[PDB]
């Protein structure tokens, strides 16, 4: 099938700036290329038709160009409502296919995450579970690495992460990282550490606790 490659994967811009998104087809597809914008819990919205055909109701700042294998979507002077996902779709050959999409995010000043660690509750332990929770909140950029250490040794299995979308109010990101152990294993160790490595600090942010303390 026809593979559409979109770039960049993500675009961080300042409102009022003009941007250009790329979409490359693995084969010539003439001008049978279409662009879409899609927001959370929302269906895609047709922006441009057949490479450069304008769509009724769509803002002026939106324009498309290209043909064959190369296409570009341009947004002149991006507004606050333009952030979200952008996809290209070809209708040249069946099956019709979509590119991987390019996320357009709002750029903001870097912000260090506020990290908080929580041991398993007595309530959960009684049931035999032991979830150690670590919140890393309101940071920017989105790129962040979290390492779990038990008695000084890195732990990877049993770790599950979850991220919020960029906040529409402060433009930051937040994430939860949870190390889920059984009570049996949790009680065979003492020190539990959540380590966050982020652009905003030369050294990782460390939050830890010992089972033998409080």
């Amino acid at each position: 099938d026809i593979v559409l490659t979109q770039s960049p994967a993500t675009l961080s811009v300042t409102p009022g700036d003009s941007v250009s998104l790329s979409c490359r087809a693995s084969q010539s597809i003439s001008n049978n290329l279409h662009w879409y914008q899609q927001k959370s819990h929302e269906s895609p919205r047709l922006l441009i038709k057949y490479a450069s055909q304008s769509i009724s109701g769509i803002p002026s700042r939106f324009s498309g160009s290209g043909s064959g294998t190369d296409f570009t979507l341009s947004i002149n002077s991006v507004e606050t409502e333009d952030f979200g996902m952008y996809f290209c779709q070809q209708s040249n050959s069946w099956p019709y296919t979509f590119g991987g999409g390019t996320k357009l995010e709002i750029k903001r000043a870097d912000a260090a995450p506020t990290v908080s660690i929580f041991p398993p509750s007595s309530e959960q332990l009684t049931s035999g579970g032991a979830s150690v929770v670590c919140f890393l909140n309101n940071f920017y950029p989105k790129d962040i690495n979290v390492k779990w250490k038990i008695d000084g040794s890195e732990r990877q299995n049993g770790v599950l992460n979850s991220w919020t979308d960029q906040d529409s109010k402060d433009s930051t990101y937040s994430m939860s990282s949870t190390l889920t152990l059984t009570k049996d294993e949790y009680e065979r160790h003492n020190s539990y550490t959540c380590e966050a490595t982020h652009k905003t600090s030369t050294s990782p942010i460390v939050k830890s606790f010992n089972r033998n303390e409080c």
Binding site: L46, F87, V133, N137
Partner: protein, 210 residues
């Protein structure tokens, strides 16, 4: 002039076949070509197939013989039928005119064999060493429930600022989610904070003061 709307069960077992309905209002279902589109996790969109203004169907080769798109000229509706589904068919389904000019709102369909299970709600209280700052962060852990969704609020909704409720994730067929809330340190624990969790499917509604 046309509006689209998807409807159908949101939970389908691997032992069942999936059916979704798209209601066309405005013009006739016989006045254009209509498609079914789905978005899998990771923002992966798939053009499943379409049915012409005359009833002719075309399907994505990858869905080969698993899919059937049909219509009813009397009711002005068209349907998506998908059999031998697996968890990989879990996604957001949309109906739309084949050119993408008009779309439905989209609807979620989860494929799982999991049984309805009430969530366990655990408190995430600050360790003694992290209550010395200007603010303090507390949390609530909701684990082992099925199916989605659950609704979590703080102090029955009166506490909404400084809250981060994360998307649920799967843990061997059961969902888990956590929420953090951050308030000025001087006001807590003197001014209590309670996590409220509701899971409609298991008729669960509980409060856990942190």
């Amino acid at each position: 002039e046309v509006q689209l709307q998807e409807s159908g069960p949101s939970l389908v077992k691997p032992s069942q076949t999936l059916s979704l309905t798209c209601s066309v209002t405005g013009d006739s279902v016989t006045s254009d070509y209509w498609s079914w589109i789905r978005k899998f996790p990771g923002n992966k969109l798939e053009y499943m197939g379409y049915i012409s203004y005359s009833g002719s169907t075309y399907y994505h080769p990858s869905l080969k013989s698993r899919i059937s798109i049909t219509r009813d000229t009397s009711k002005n509706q068209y349907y998506l039928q998908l059999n031998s589904v697996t968890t990989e068919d879990t996604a957001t389904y949309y109906c739309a005119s084949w050119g993408g000019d008009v779309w439905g709102a989209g609807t979620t369909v989860t494929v799982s064999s999991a049984k309805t299970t009430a969530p366990s709600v655990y408190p995430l209280a600050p360790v003694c060493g992290d209550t010395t700052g200007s603010s303090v962060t507390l949390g609530c852990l909701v684990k082992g429930y099925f199916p989605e969704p659950v609704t979590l609020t703080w102090n029955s909704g009166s506490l909404s600022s400084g809250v981060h409720t994360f998307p649920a994730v799967l843990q061997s067929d059961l969902y888990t989610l956590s929420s953090s809330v951050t308030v000025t340190s001087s006001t807590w624990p003197s001014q209590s904070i309670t996590c409220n969790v509701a899971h409609p499917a298991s008729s669960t509604k509980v409060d856990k003061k942190i």
